[PDB]
Structure formats: structure tokens, C-alpha cells
């Protein structure tokens, strides 16, 4: 059955078909309206329930199988005045002293020691990106009707891991997280990814540095594919696309290398609803022939009226990781735009140069090459991340 469950608890889940999984939600929610994108009334203090009582009490009696007076009694008893230890207007910036929470004692221990001239600041908590992604998109609605999320639509959470692996840590992961819709196709996620590998350039131009190539890798090659549950989804919408799956299968299926048989499909063949996938399981995506991204589905859920309903912002980037820039070795402060080899001036090979240091060190006033070296243009993945 397409019934979610853990395979390794809180790490990865058992497989289910995405479309049947959404229909399994909607068979328990369709008609009830709890999955909708329309604003419902909310709980409040008992003293202002008069306006809402006529609508609320009849429905409460209907669903709880109780009388109107019983519904009113429940609505009065379950008012938020019994729970709001905080009055409407109190700020979150201070720990109230009128509390017995162990959590707030630990929070007191967190906060108070920072109240010193060395530590007074309002800097980041642990990570900066996530709430900025939420705030700028949460609760918005599109300007165009065609860019509106359908009610009850499935929202996946996909972690696209960077090709630059830390190779000193393995618990936490390098990735950027993008939400995608179940009805949308893999082509759109492939197009949305801004990865720097599309911008790769090269060529040796020490004799004529101004002749850097006119084409980025995105203009020369457009190959890309996802890989799920043993199948490839390769893009073939352009003549600059090659089916890398064939090259992969023809080698991987030639021996018991540790992998099963595979199957081939195009990028435009599958919606995310058509997939049968495991959450938390490392899947694969690739483009430009060598830029492999590990794909992890970290979450999948129905859309709700509090979510970002403006589809112009989708695939909705929701988390990211902060790679460092490749700073020039000469000045040790500025980001490099050039890399050289066989350099008679540089102390090491390879040596990374910024545009300012590269040109002045290796050329004269009129730009003629000085010394012995080879140079290549450089686009920094530590910057374009």
C-alpha cells in the first residue's frame, strides 16, 4: 500500500506513489474543507464570541453530536483566556519572570551571559536563510490566475545537494532546498536550478586575456537528468542535449558493480505525481555531464491557505548553504577571476588571481605577455552559489 512509514526512524521513509499518496490525503479531507486555501475563522477570547456564535454552535452540534447549549458551553470553557498566559501586546524579546518552565530557565542561561559589552548584539540565531525565504513568500497570492496553486495540491520539499562536497563532514549536508508541486514536471525543477555548473568556462588565454570565450557551458551543452527509483529522466528538448543515461547504463550494467538494472525516460515524461519515491533517501540529479546533485525529498505535504500560493515564486527556494569565496592568493582579500599554471611569478601551481592582480602582474602597460605562464578564465562557485 502507498501508506507512509519509516524505514530508518526519522531518517528515511518507505516508498509510496505520489499521486496515490495525494489522493489518500484527499479521500480523508475532500469535502471537509480543512485542506482548502480559504481563510477560516480562528479561536479567540470568550468575550467576543457573540458574532461567531451563530455560525459556530450549529456546526459544533452537528459534528460533536451535542446540543446547541452544550456547544456554547464547550465554546466558552475552551476559550483562549484559559490558556493565554500572555496578553495580546506582550513582546517576545524578554523572558517573563512569572514562569516555571525548565525551557525558559535554560533560555535564561542562554541569554543572560551575552549581556556584556563583548557580547551585546542582535546577530543571527543559528542560520539566516530559512525565515527570509518564508517571510517574503508565506501568505502571498499571485497577480495572475494562471500562477495560483490548486487547492489540495501536493507540495514536495527537495534538497538539491551541491557538487562541492565538504569531504570533512558527513552528518550535515551541502544543499539548497526547493519546494515543487506534484502536478509540475521535472523539466521545471531542472530549469529553475541556478547551479553554477551551467556557467562553467575555460580555455587558455595567457597570450590574449581579453579573448575569453563567448559561450558559457549553458550555451554549449544543455544535458541534464533526474534519477529516481532506478530510472533516468533526461532532457532532450534542444539539439545541445545528449542522453547521458545511455552512457551511464552501458557501463553500469556490464558487471555486478553493486547496482541493479535501470530504465530510461525523458525529462518531460513525468510529473512529480507520477513518481514513486522515498523521503530522505538519496536520489540523483545531474547536468553538464559531470555536475551530479544528490536529491533528497525531505518533505511532502498538501498545500494550505497559510502557504505561499504565488506560483511565480515556485520552485520555492526555502533553505541554502553558505559556500566560501575563492579569494585571490596575491591580495588574499579579493575574489579570483583567473587561474594560472606554469606561472613563473606565482609561488605555487595552481595560483588563483583576481582580474586586477592577474593583468598587472603578467602584462606590461600595453598588455603584452610577460614571463612564462598559462592562464584560464574563472567563474567562482564560491560566489555564484
Amino acid at each position: 500500500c502507498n501508506f507512509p512509514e519509516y524505514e530508518l526512524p526519522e531518517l528515511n521513509t518507505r516508498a509510496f506513489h505520489v499521486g496515490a499518496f495525494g489522493e489518500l490525503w484527499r479521500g480523508r479531507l475532500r469535502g471537509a474543507g480543512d485542506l482548502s486555501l480559504r481563510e477560516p475563522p480562528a479561536s479567540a477570547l470568550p468575550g467576543s464570541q457573540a458574532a461567531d456564535s451563530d455560525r459556530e454552535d450549529a456546526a459544533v452540534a452537528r459534528d460533536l453530536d451535542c446540543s446547541l447549549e452544550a456547544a456554547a458551553e464547550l465554546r466558552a470553557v475552551c476559550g483562549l483566556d484559559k490558556l493565554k498566559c500572555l496578553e495580546d501586546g506582550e513582546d517576545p524579546e524578554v523572558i517573563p519572570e512569572n514562569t516555571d518552565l525548565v525551557t525558559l530557565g535554560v533560555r535564561k542561561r542562554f541569554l543572560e551571559h551575552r549581556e556584556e559589552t563583548i557580547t551585546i548584539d542582535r546577530a543571527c540565531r543559528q542560520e539566516t536563510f530559512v525565515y527570509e525565504m518564508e517571510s517574503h513568500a508565506i501568505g502571498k497570492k499571485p497577480e495572475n490566475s494562471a500562477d495560483m496553486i490548486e487547492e489540495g495540491e501536493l507540495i514536495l520539499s527537495v534538497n538539491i545537494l551541491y557538487p562541492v562536497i565538504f569531504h570533512k563532514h558527513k552528518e550535515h549536508k551541502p544543499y539548497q532546498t526547493m519546494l515543487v508541486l506534484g502536478s509540475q514536471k521535472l523539466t521545471q525543477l531542472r530549469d529553475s536550478i541556478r547551479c553554477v555548473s551551467d556557467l562553467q568556462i575555460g580555455g587558455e588565454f595567457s597570450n590574449t586575456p581579453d579573448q575569453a570565450p563567448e559561450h558559457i557551458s549553458k550555451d554549449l551543452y544543455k544535458s541534464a537528468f533526474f534519477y529516481f527509483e532506478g530510472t533516468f529522466y533526461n532532457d532532450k528538448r534542444y539539439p545541445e542535449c545528449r542522453d547521458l543515461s545511455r552512457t551511464i547504463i552501458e557501463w553500469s550494467e556490464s558487471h555486478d558493480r553493486g547496482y541493479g538494472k535501470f530504465q530510461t525516460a525523458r525529462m518531460e515524461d513525468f510529473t512529480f505525481n507520477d513518481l514513486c519515491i522515498k523521503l530522505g533517501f538519496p536520489y540523483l540529479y545531474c547536468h553538464q555531464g559531470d555536475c551530479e546533485h544528490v536529491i533528497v525529498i525531505t518533505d511532502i505535504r498538501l498545500v494550505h491557505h497559510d502557504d505561499c500560493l504565488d506560483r511565480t515564486l515556485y520552485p520555492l527556494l526555502i533553505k541554502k548553504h553558505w559556500l566560501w569565496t575563492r579569494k585571490c592568493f596575491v591580495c588574499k582579500m579579493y575574489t579570483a577571476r583567473w587561474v594560472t599554471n606554469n606561472d613563473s611569478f606565482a609561488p605555487e601551481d595552481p595560483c588563483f588571481f583576481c582580474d586586477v592582480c592577474f593583468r598587472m602582474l603578467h602584462y606590461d602597460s600595453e598588455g603584452n605577455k610577460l614571463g612564462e605562464f598559462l592562464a584560464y578564465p574563472y567563474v567562482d562557485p564560491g560566489t555564484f552559489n
Binding site: F3, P4, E5, T13, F21, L24, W25, R28, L29, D34, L35, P40, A42, S43, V60, D63, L64, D65, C66, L74, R75, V77, C78, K82, L83, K84, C85, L86, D91, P92, E93, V94, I95, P96, N98, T99, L101, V102, T103, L104, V106, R107, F110, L111, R125, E127, T128, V130, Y131, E134, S135, I138, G139, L279, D299, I300, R301, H304, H305, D306
Partner: protein, 141 residues
């Protein structure tokens, strides 16, 4: 990230001391809530990201006690804990309880049980959370 710092201690203390009341009414749980002022948890110089994330994690942690194999009374206390956490939060928009597909139908059946048990405070609070749509239809908690 998992259990928020020290939150599990407070949650289990409140739930156990409520269960010791031998009562299922919401009023006793609110008396315990307000005596130790649990609702103050969302203050404490919590910038927005931490506020939202802590709300999410706390609601899932209380979900784990709202689920089986816990008995009726302790599940009712967990439901009251979820109600208090959700309606005392200072988030905008209000963050949600993560509810699994494997849990949603069992929890509707628990709504039916609360209705049939005549302990209508828990049933009304569950329907109030549904009206608030605090429950988020997510694959896992």
C-alpha cells in the same frame, strides 16, 4: 533538530501531573497550565526563525504524546498541550502541527472516540484546532 532544549521535561511534567488529576476536563489542564504559566514559552528573545522552528518542533513533540500507545486521559492532556502551544504562539502566520497520513485517520477516529466518551472538551478542542487548521497534512511528524 528534534526535542527543543528542556521542552520535553516541561511537557512530560505537565502531562503527568495532569494525568495524576484522574480528570479529563479541560479546566484542570488549564489550571495547571496557568499555575506554572506554560504559555510564556514562546517569549524569550526568540527571533522569527527560532520562533517558527520552535513552534513546529514543540507541536510535533506534543503530537507524539497525542498519538498512541498512550491511553485516553494522557492523549487528552496531549491534545490540550497542542491547543495551548498552538494558540499561545506569537508566529505570523501561525505555525502548524505536523500530522502524518498514517495518523490522520486514526486521529479522526480519536475525534469519534472523544465524542462517544462524552468528554466533549477534548472533542471541541480538536474541532477547534481543525477550524484553526493547526494540523498540517505532512508525510511525517
Amino acid at each position: 533538530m528534534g526535542t527543543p532544549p528542556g521542552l520535553q521535561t516541561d511537557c512530560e511534567a505537565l502531562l503527568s501531573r495532569f494525568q495524576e488529576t484522574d480528570s479529563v476536563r479541560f479546566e484542570d489542564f488549564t489550571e495547571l497550565w496557568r499555575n506554572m504559566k506554560f504559555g510564556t514559552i514562546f517569549c524569550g528573545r526568540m527571533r522569527n526563525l527560532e520562533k517558527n522552528m520552535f513552534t513546529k518542533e514543540a507541536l510535533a513533540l506534543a503530537w507524539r504524546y497525542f498519538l498512541p500507545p498512550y491511553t485516553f486521559q494522557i492523549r487528552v492532556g496531549a491534545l490540550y498541550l497542542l491547543y495551548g502551544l498552538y494558540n499561545t504562539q506569537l508566529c505570523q502566520p501561525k505555525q502548524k502541527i505536523r500530522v502524518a497520513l498514517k495518523d490522520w485517520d486514526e486521529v479522526l477516529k480519536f475525534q469519534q472516540d472523544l465524542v462517544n466518551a462524552q468528554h466533549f472538551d477534548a472533542a471541541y478542542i480538536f474541532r477547534k484546532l481543525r477550524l484553526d487548521r493547526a494540523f498540517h497534512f505532512t508525510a511525517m511528524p
